[PDB]
Design a protein around this ligand. Sequence first.
Ligand SMILES: [Mg+2]
Ligand SMILES: [Mg+2]
Ligand SMILES: [Mg+2]
Ligand SMILES: [Mg+2]
Ligand SMILES: [Mg+2]
Ligand SMILES: [Mg+2]
Ligand SMILES: [Mg+2]
Ligand SMILES: [Mg+2]
Ligand SMILES: [Mg+2]
Ligand SMILES: [Mg+2]
Ligand SMILES: [Mg+2]
Ligand SMILES: [Mg+2]
Ligand SMILES: [Mg+2]
Ligand SMILES: [Mg+2]
Ligand SMILES: [Mg+2]
Ligand SMILES: [Mg+2]
Ligand SMILES: [Mg+2]
Ligand SMILES: [Mg+2]
Ligand SMILES: [Mg+2]
Ligand SMILES: [Mg+2]
Ligand SMILES: [Mg+2]
Ligand SMILES: [Mg+2]
Ligand SMILES: [Mg+2]
Ligand SMILES: [Mg+2]
Ligand SMILES: [Mg+2]
Ligand SMILES: [Mg+2]
Ligand SMILES: [Mg+2]
Ligand SMILES: [Mg+2]
Ligand SMILES: [Mg+2]
Ligand SMILES: [Mg+2]
Ligand SMILES: [Mg+2]
Ligand SMILES: [Mg+2]
Ligand SMILES: [Mg+2]
Lengths: 47, 96, 82
Amino acid sequence: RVNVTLACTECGDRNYITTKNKRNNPERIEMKKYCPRLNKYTLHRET
Amino acid sequence: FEGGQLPLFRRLPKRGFTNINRKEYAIVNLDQLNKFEDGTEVTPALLVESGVVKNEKSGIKILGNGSLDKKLTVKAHKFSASAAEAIDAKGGAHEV
Amino acid sequence: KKGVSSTKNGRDSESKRLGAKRADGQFVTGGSILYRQRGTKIYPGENVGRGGDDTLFAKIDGVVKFERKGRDKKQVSVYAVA
RNA sequence: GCCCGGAUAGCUCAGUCGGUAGAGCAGGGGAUUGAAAAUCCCCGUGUCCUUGGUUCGAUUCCGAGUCCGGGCACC
RNA sequence: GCCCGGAUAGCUCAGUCGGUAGAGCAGGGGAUUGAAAAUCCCCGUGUCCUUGGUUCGAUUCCGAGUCCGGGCACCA
RNA sequence: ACAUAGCAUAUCAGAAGGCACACCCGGAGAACUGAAACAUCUUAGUACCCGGAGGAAGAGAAAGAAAAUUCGAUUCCCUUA
RNA sequence: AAGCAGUAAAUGUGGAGCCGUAGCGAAAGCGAGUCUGAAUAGGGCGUUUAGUAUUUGGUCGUAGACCCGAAACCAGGUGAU
RNA sequence: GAGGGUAGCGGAGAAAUUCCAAUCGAACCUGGAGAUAGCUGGUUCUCUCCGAAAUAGCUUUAGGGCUAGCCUCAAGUGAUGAUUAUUGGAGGUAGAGCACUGUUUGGACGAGGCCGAAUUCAGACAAACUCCGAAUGCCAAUUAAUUUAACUUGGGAGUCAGAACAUGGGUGAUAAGGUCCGUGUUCGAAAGGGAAACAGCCCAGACCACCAGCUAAGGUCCCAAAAU
RNA sequence: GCUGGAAGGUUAAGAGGAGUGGUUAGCUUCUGCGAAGCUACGAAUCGAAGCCCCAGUAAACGGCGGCCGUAACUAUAACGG
RNA sequence: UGAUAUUGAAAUUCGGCACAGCUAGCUGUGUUGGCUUUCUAACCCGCACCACUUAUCGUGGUGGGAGACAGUGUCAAGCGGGCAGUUUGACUGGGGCGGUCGCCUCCUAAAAGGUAACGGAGGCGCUCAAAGGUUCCCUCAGAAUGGUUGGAAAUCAUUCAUAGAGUGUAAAGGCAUAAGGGAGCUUGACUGCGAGACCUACAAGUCGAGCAGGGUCGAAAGACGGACUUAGUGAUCCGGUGGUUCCGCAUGGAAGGGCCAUCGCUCAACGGAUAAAAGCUACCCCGGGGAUAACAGGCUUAUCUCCCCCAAGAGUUCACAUCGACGGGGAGGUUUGGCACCUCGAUGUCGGCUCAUCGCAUCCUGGGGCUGUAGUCGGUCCCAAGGGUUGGGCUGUUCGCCCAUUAAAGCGGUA
RNA sequence: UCUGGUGACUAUAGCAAGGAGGUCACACCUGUUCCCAUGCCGAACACAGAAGUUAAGGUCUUUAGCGACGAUGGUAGCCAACUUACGUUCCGCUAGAGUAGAACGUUGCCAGGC
Ligand SMILES: [Mg+2]
Ligand SMILES: [Mg+2]
Ligand SMILES: [Mg+2]
Ligand SMILES: [Mg+2]
Ligand SMILES: [Mg+2]
Ligand SMILES: [Mg+2]
Ligand SMILES: [Mg+2]
Ligand SMILES: [Mg+2]
Ligand SMILES: [Mg+2]
Ligand SMILES: [Mg+2]
Ligand SMILES: [Mg+2]
Ligand SMILES: [Mg+2]
Ligand SMILES: [Mg+2]
Ligand SMILES: [Mg+2]
Ligand SMILES: [Mg+2]
Ligand SMILES: [Mg+2]
Ligand SMILES: [Mg+2]
Ligand SMILES: [Mg+2]
Ligand SMILES: [Mg+2]
Ligand SMILES: [Mg+2]
Ligand SMILES: [Mg+2]
Ligand SMILES: [Mg+2]
Ligand SMILES: [Mg+2]
Ligand SMILES: [Mg+2]
Ligand SMILES: [Mg+2]
Ligand SMILES: [Mg+2]
Ligand SMILES: [Mg+2]
Ligand SMILES: [Mg+2]
Ligand SMILES: [Mg+2]
Ligand SMILES: [Mg+2]
Ligand SMILES: [Mg+2]
Ligand SMILES: [Mg+2]
Ligand SMILES: [Mg+2]
């Protein structure tokens, strides 16, 4: 039930919000979403 | 005072800061020049004492929202982009 | 002068405003709300699209008509023509 | 007329936070030994208070309920 | 949301600074002696918390990790 | 014991007290009240108290203001607001 | 405005200032349009002109602010007949 | 008995909250000081025009306030406001009904080795039961007839203690001049006539004069106008 | 609560000064070191009483239980769990 | 109780740190704190003697005793009702007590919306990397009928099954085009927005066609800016972290601000007074109220006192001489209450003495019926207010029991 | 007209029964090499084909027995009026629900072939 932020790896910032429900996927969570000023789809990492 | 309920100026949030140097150009429009003649100059010693501008804080910008209608010669402080076309339309230099 | 029992519930919800918000015949505009419900009591027809389980709202201009097309179901259409 | 604690081997207590019942006193049958009392084995049935509902499932959560212990008790 | 201590025979503690696991309470079997309790021998399984990496080798050093004890706690 | 405190005579008028305490300058300094309660805050460095002067006291001759070209001791009035 | 002259004449001078002729944005800055925004897309606030000075009314704010009334608090003193 | 001491954040007390200049849970007298008061009482000359509310939301808030609601002048916009006929519509009450979850009393129906266990026929009940389902109200016709409003902006408020009747309801005991909502009327803020007198019921709205006539509600032998 | 105890945890002013930031002398000249100076911060370590810890004290403050069973007719229990 | 000043000398030690040398540990070796003592000039002696002086104060010398401690300042911790300013909510059929305080769903609610009460029923302060998006395909719980195991019912088939199942969560409204159940891929659980509506005091609150940039799924048409809806949350201020084309008080930097994204509150009394808050007054004080109680009027009759129907039964036999189970209908306004209408700018409150006055549902006396009335007594009922209705013990008593009588020791209203 | 494909019509249209045929057009089957695929099995999905069959599906003609629609009259409720404290009447408009009369075994657009 933990809030966690996703990190635009080339963008060099933090932009999104998710809800990683803790022990049902305790690993790192990496998706493909939009990251502006780069206008692409970067991997966003659960940090 | 809404009676214990907190007033309207506690819910709304505050934002901003003013400045320490917020140079306020006395904005003379371009329409006001359509009264005089000979096209000699316009001047921070003259454009005061023809009653047009008074107590210019710093700089007297020529914003353009009238019609020049004369081959006039200016000497202002600094300009606007469209009105600087109107002075060079009919013909006249300056010293920005 | 005896200590009376405690009540249990009270405790109502607030309200929501439901029902029709425009009526048969008049002239509506392309964002307005026709009808709204917590379910599906009125299906949409042509030129009327649903929302999130609520708020049948007109797509484009015109006047409204109510109509049934089954034995129980009812629908709403808007015809722009005049 | 009001809020809680609960009825847990025949006796006394235990967990009893929905899949998940324990001890000791008692009883019975052996052994002891002149005969009983001690003393030592081996055993069992509990009741999870009446009853319905959230029930994959209630000893376990609500309340239609009996009884009693803790405070009620106001000018 | 933060820094440490660690899960070391069934119970309690010990070293556990990479080659290098110990005690006592408990349990079982003998002996005692009318019968138990003491009392005396002889024994065993530890767990070095889940898991990966620096690994000639990790109970031992990092951290992906569960639980609890010591401080957090500021002028929202 | 050397001198000092101490002690004895002679001159001097310096002080003390009072003031309109109205105005001023330093020492010391509350609470009622407002915040719709109240403790930081504010009523306020206000009233009471005490000390020293004046016809006026205090300030004062830049270790200043300023940013352009600089002008210039302090006080007070109007605007900056 | 203050000041300076003047039957404590309400009139002469004084243009330091204030408001208005242009807004938008937190700000740099931009300008009849800016602002957010990748956008000339769409929006919010503007543009097309009337403000100004004095005064008679109505009402607000700060002062005790329609009058009359409390127990009660804090200073500074007078009282053991 | 005569002298003397202890003074308010204090003094004295064989302790009672007793005593301290006819007193005291903290004396008196000035000054801050016209303390504050969401609380009572009071507010002075006349006449014309129009004239409400006692509710909603939120509050250390329930007898106070702020905003919306209802009145008032001043400007505007100016057919948008009101009823009525016509058509088209939204929704599930009164009523009805047992197909639905539930409650029921009767008949035959099966379901062990002398009284009971699914279904079927004939009947009933319901705010949280509806296969049905009206009267009225309610929004809209670029609809037609009649009348007088409506809305936008800007100055000035007052109300946020309501009451009885007539009906739909909850609570109460189909009890109240009870309390709490809907919806109308009147009183509040309305005098007259009738109900013996009587704010709330029944007629009807007072600009003033007159020794004039018809009529409403109630009445007509007498008190007391009118038919023994 | 009060007295007595001395080791350990827990602390404050103060003493210490490992380091991190800002700045430019010089400098690759685009590109971070920064010596030194001056400044903003500050680490382990040391630093008592208290509180934890142990023992004593009731003419100190305070406290001084329930439930079942049994007797040569019944009754209740000297007694037992 | 510590630090540091006034505040000086000497020694013993026990240290950490900077170096050398050797076997992690010791010698010298220098910084460098402490720790015990030991002196003596500061300081203190309500410490004896002498002078000012004839004097218990005081000043000065002399001898003694303590001694770098104390006493004093400055800064820092813990103690601290001894003393001070203060807070201690509201709703409420009067108040404390009990329970409540915001959101979600029904009903009451009177066929639009709205609509209260301490009216009736239930929940929430989240959960899900797939239970979200897309493209395809499938239809249920049950009722029978038989079939290794037998739950009555854990799988298998066949047939009749309109939704009687299921939808992560409580209820209503929906769904069999599925919005239910599987299977393949993937992140639209995007960025910048938004014509116009609904609701509304405000702040908030939801619904949005379409527009650009980048996609996912699909053959394509199209769908997708979270889960069938409606709950699952908290203004401002202040602070933290990540960016920033922005300001940065001579100029250049920094420190600090502002924007944009985000975290910290059971502030749960949920529009949150503050960063931080509990009780008793019978010693009471002021301002107010019948808006709001106790006593007494008033309205009502649940209880209460009297009648009354119906008739099973008891009375050896007979329902009605007397008694009346189960059930119903009313009068009175004396008890216990309910409501808050008058009174808080005072309407004095229980018993008893004094003095009465009025009803009749009658206690005695007068008149009758009926008796399961031999007579004398007695039961029960009708008409009747003219008159009578006792002395003592007990407790404040009312009430009550008890003693001795009498023709009887009536029940009530009259604030 | 009739058979088929796609529309609209509230099941008046559908189920329930019963009789009739052919496959010129749907089916039934013949298989799985390929297109594709069954958490398995080509029954289904798809593909390749045409010897058989009208029994079945679908088509057509009867049956109102199952559901469904459904009038005229009534009665309850009810806006307005009147009278009255009665679980009320009385007068004037709208007017169901159930139940009976019954209608009903579909209708109609457009395509390609008879
Ligand atoms: Mg005396
Ligand atoms: Mg006392
Ligand atoms: Mg005395
Ligand atoms: Mg006063
Ligand atoms: Mg004052
Ligand atoms: Mg009028
Ligand atoms: Mg009904
Ligand atoms: Mg009803
Ligand atoms: Mg009534
Ligand atoms: Mg009303
Ligand atoms: Mg009126
Ligand atoms: Mg009269
Ligand atoms: Mg008369
Ligand atoms: Mg350093
Ligand atoms: Mg001396
Ligand atoms: Mg106190
Ligand atoms: Mg209250
Ligand atoms: Mg109460
Ligand atoms: Mg409604
Ligand atoms: Mg600078
Ligand atoms: Mg500077
Ligand atoms: Mg007393
Ligand atoms: Mg009373
Ligand atoms: Mg009665
Ligand atoms: Mg009474
Ligand atoms: Mg009332
Ligand atoms: Mg009064
Ligand atoms: Mg009076
Ligand atoms: Mg009195
Ligand atoms: Mg009588
Ligand atoms: Mg009498
Ligand atoms: Mg006696
Ligand atoms: Mg096959």
